[PDB]
Each structure stands twice: as structure tokens, then as C-alpha cells.
Scaffold this motif. Structure first.
Motif, mmCIF file in Angstrom:
data_model
loop_
_atom_site.group_PDB
_atom_site.id
_atom_site.type_symbol
_atom_site.label_atom_id
_atom_site.label_comp_id
_atom_site.label_asym_id
_atom_site.label_seq_id
_atom_site.Cartn_x
_atom_site.Cartn_y
_atom_site.Cartn_z
ATOM 1 N N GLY A 1 77.925 -10.744 -52.314
ATOM 2 C CA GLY A 1 76.739 -10.998 -51.447
ATOM 3 C C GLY A 1 76.999 -10.441 -50.053
ATOM 4 O O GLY A 1 76.691 -9.284 -49.769
ATOM 5 N N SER A 2 77.569 -11.270 -49.185
ATOM 6 C CA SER A 2 77.866 -10.848 -47.822
ATOM 7 C C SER A 2 79.060 -9.897 -47.805
ATOM 8 O O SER A 2 79.782 -9.775 -48.794
ATOM 9 C CB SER A 2 78.170 -12.069 -46.952
ATOM 10 N N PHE A 3 79.258 -9.225 -46.679
ATOM 11 C CA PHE A 3 80.366 -8.287 -46.543
ATOM 12 C C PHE A 3 81.137 -8.555 -45.256
ATOM 13 O O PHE A 3 81.543 -9.685 -44.986
ATOM 14 C CB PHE A 3 79.838 -6.851 -46.536
ATOM 15 N N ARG A 4 81.329 -7.508 -44.462
ATOM 16 C CA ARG A 4 82.046 -7.639 -43.201
ATOM 17 C C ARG A 4 81.075 -7.552 -42.028
ATOM 18 O O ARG A 4 81.476 -7.617 -40.868
ATOM 19 C CB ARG A 4 83.100 -6.535 -43.079
ATOM 20 N N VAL A 5 79.791 -7.404 -42.346
ATOM 21 C CA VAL A 5 78.763 -7.306 -41.317
ATOM 22 C C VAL A 5 78.733 -8.570 -40.463
ATOM 23 O O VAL A 5 79.438 -9.540 -40.748
ATOM 24 C CB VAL A 5 77.396 -7.094 -41.968
ATOM 25 N N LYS A 6 77.914 -8.553 -39.417
ATOM 26 C CA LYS A 6 77.799 -9.703 -38.526
ATOM 27 C C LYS A 6 76.338 -9.941 -38.141
ATOM 28 O O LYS A 6 75.810 -9.274 -37.252
ATOM 29 C CB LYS A 6 78.625 -9.461 -37.260
ATOM 30 N N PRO A 7 75.677 -10.869 -38.789
ATOM 31 C CA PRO A 7 74.250 -11.186 -38.503
ATOM 32 C C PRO A 7 74.092 -12.061 -37.260
ATOM 33 O O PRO A 7 75.069 -12.595 -36.736
ATOM 34 C CB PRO A 7 73.790 -11.931 -39.755
ATOM 35 N N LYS A 12 70.487 -17.221 -37.125
ATOM 36 C CA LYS A 12 71.233 -17.283 -38.378
ATOM 37 C C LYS A 12 70.306 -17.029 -39.549
ATOM 38 O O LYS A 12 70.710 -17.104 -40.709
ATOM 39 C CB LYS A 12 71.892 -18.657 -38.541
ATOM 40 N N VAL A 13 69.060 -16.732 -39.233
ATOM 41 C CA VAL A 13 68.070 -16.469 -40.260
ATOM 42 C C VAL A 13 67.709 -14.992 -40.276
ATOM 43 O O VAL A 13 66.879 -14.553 -41.072
ATOM 44 C CB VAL A 13 66.822 -17.303 -39.990
ATOM 45 N N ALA A 14 68.337 -14.230 -39.387
ATOM 46 C CA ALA A 14 68.067 -12.799 -39.309
ATOM 47 C C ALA A 14 69.351 -12.008 -39.085
ATOM 48 O O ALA A 14 70.320 -12.518 -38.523
ATOM 49 C CB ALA A 14 67.090 -12.516 -38.169
ATOM 50 N N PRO A 15 69.366 -10.772 -39.511
ATOM 51 C CA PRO A 15 70.548 -9.876 -39.356
ATOM 52 C C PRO A 15 70.730 -9.410 -37.914
ATOM 53 O O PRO A 15 71.688 -9.798 -37.244
ATOM 54 C CB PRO A 15 70.224 -8.695 -40.274
ATOM 55 N N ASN A 22 68.656 9.562 -32.886
ATOM 56 C CA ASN A 22 68.965 10.925 -33.309
ATOM 57 C C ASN A 22 70.124 10.975 -34.306
ATOM 58 O O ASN A 22 71.286 11.080 -33.918
ATOM 59 C CB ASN A 22 69.320 11.773 -32.087
ATOM 60 N N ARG A 23 69.790 10.932 -35.593
ATOM 61 C CA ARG A 23 70.800 11.006 -36.650
ATOM 62 C C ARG A 23 71.694 9.773 -36.670
ATOM 63 O O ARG A 23 72.426 9.548 -37.634
ATOM 64 C CB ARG A 23 71.664 12.255 -36.453
ATOM 65 N N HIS A 24 71.644 8.977 -35.611
ATOM 66 C CA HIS A 24 72.469 7.780 -35.547
ATOM 67 C C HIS A 24 71.614 6.526 -35.675
ATOM 68 O O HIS A 24 70.423 6.535 -35.362
ATOM 69 C CB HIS A 24 73.230 7.735 -34.222
ATOM 70 N N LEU A 25 72.241 5.446 -36.123
ATOM 71 C CA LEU A 25 71.549 4.174 -36.277
ATOM 72 C C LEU A 25 72.050 3.197 -35.233
ATOM 73 O O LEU A 25 73.254 3.002 -35.089
ATOM 74 C CB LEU A 25 71.809 3.588 -37.663
ATOM 75 N N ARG A 26 71.010 2.508 -34.542
ATOM 76 C CA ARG A 26 71.409 1.564 -33.516
ATOM 77 C C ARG A 26 71.055 0.142 -33.914
ATOM 78 O O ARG A 26 70.048 -0.191 -34.199
ATOM 79 C CB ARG A 26 70.730 1.901 -32.191
ATOM 80 N N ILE A 27 72.057 -0.723 -33.886
ATOM 81 C CA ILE A 27 71.855 -2.119 -34.229
ATOM 82 C C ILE A 27 71.971 -2.971 -32.968
ATOM 83 O O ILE A 27 72.546 -2.542 -31.968
ATOM 84 C CB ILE A 27 72.890 -2.560 -35.278
ATOM 85 N N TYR A 28 71.550 -4.104 -33.000
ATOM 86 C CA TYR A 28 71.592 -5.013 -31.860
ATOM 87 C C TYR A 28 72.395 -6.264 -32.211
ATOM 88 O O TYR A 28 72.595 -6.572 -33.385
ATOM 89 C CB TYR A 28 70.171 -5.404 -31.459
ATOM 90 N N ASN A 29 72.858 -6.978 -31.190
ATOM 91 C CA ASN A 29 73.642 -8.188 -31.418
ATOM 92 C C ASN A 29 72.730 -9.396 -31.604
ATOM 93 O O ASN A 29 73.168 -10.451 -32.064
ATOM 94 C CB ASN A 29 74.585 -8.433 -30.238
ATOM 95 N N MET A 30 71.462 -9.237 -31.244
ATOM 96 C CA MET A 30 70.500 -10.326 -31.379
ATOM 97 C C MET A 30 69.156 -9.796 -31.864
ATOM 98 O O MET A 30 68.691 -8.753 -31.409
ATOM 99 C CB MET A 30 70.315 -11.030 -30.034
#
Ligand SMILES: Nc1ncnc2c1ncn2[C@@H]1O[C@H](COP(=O)(O)OP(=O)(O)OP(=O)(O)O)[C@@H](O)[C@H]1O
Ligand SMILES: [Zn+2]
Length: 64
Positions: A1-7, A12-15, A22-30
Motif C-alpha cells: 500500500g504505502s511506500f516511502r512517500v510523505k503525505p 492526513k486525509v490528503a497527499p 517544465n519536464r519536472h514535477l513539483r510537490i508541496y509539503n501541505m
């Protein structure tokens, strides 16, 4: 199920909102919600994002 990611934790109900740089993916901490709330509660914390490249991964938290 889960991996090493950090939601999110404030919900705690969202990733964690993400965006494409540009070719890169940006994630946020919140998520978008907690993100805006982070401005309230966080004011100046938990502010950090991760960018993924079509070859390597990167982190950009404490910038100051
Ligand atoms: N939802 C979030 N969660 C945590 N930190 C965030 C969030 N959104 C913004 N930040 C913080 O603010 C910055 C993100 O703003 P961002 O750079 O993504 O706008 P941008 O338009 O994509 O930048 P640019 O205009 O150069 O393309 C990052 O340094 C990050 O730490
Ligand atoms: Zn959240």
C-alpha cells in the motif's frame, strides 16, 4: 500500500498538492487547503516543496 512517500499531516486525509515545472514535477509539503491554512496556522513553517526531474529528484525546504 504505502511506500516511502510523505503525505500531509494537518489533514492526513490528503497527499500534498502538486504542480508541473517544465519536464519536472513539483510537490508541496501541505495540501491546497492546509497550505492556505498553513498561512494561518503555519504563518511561516512547514513551507517546503519537492521538484522531480526526468532524471533526478530534488528538495527545496528551508530557503530563507
Ligand atoms: N502548499 C504548499 N506547501 C508548502 N509549501 C509551499 C506550498 N506552496 C508554496 N510553498 C512554498 O512557496 C514556494 C512555492 O511557490 P512556487 O515557486 O511553487 O510558485 P511558482 O510560480 O511555481 O514559482 P515560479 O513563479 O518561479 O514558477 C516554495 O518555496 C514552497 O516552499
Ligand atoms: Zn493537508
Amino acid at each position: 500500500g504505502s511506500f516511502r512517500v510523505k503525505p500531509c499531516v494537518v489533514c492526513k486525509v490528503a497527499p500534498r498538492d502538486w504542480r508541473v515545472k517544465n519536464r519536472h514535477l513539483r510537490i508541496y509539503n501541505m495540501c491546497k487547503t492546509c497550505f492556505n491554512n498553513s498561512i494561518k496556522s503555519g504563518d511561516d513553517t512547514y513551507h517546503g516543496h519537492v521538484d522531480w526531474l526526468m532524471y533526478t529528484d530534488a528538495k527545496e525546504f528551508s530557503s530563507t
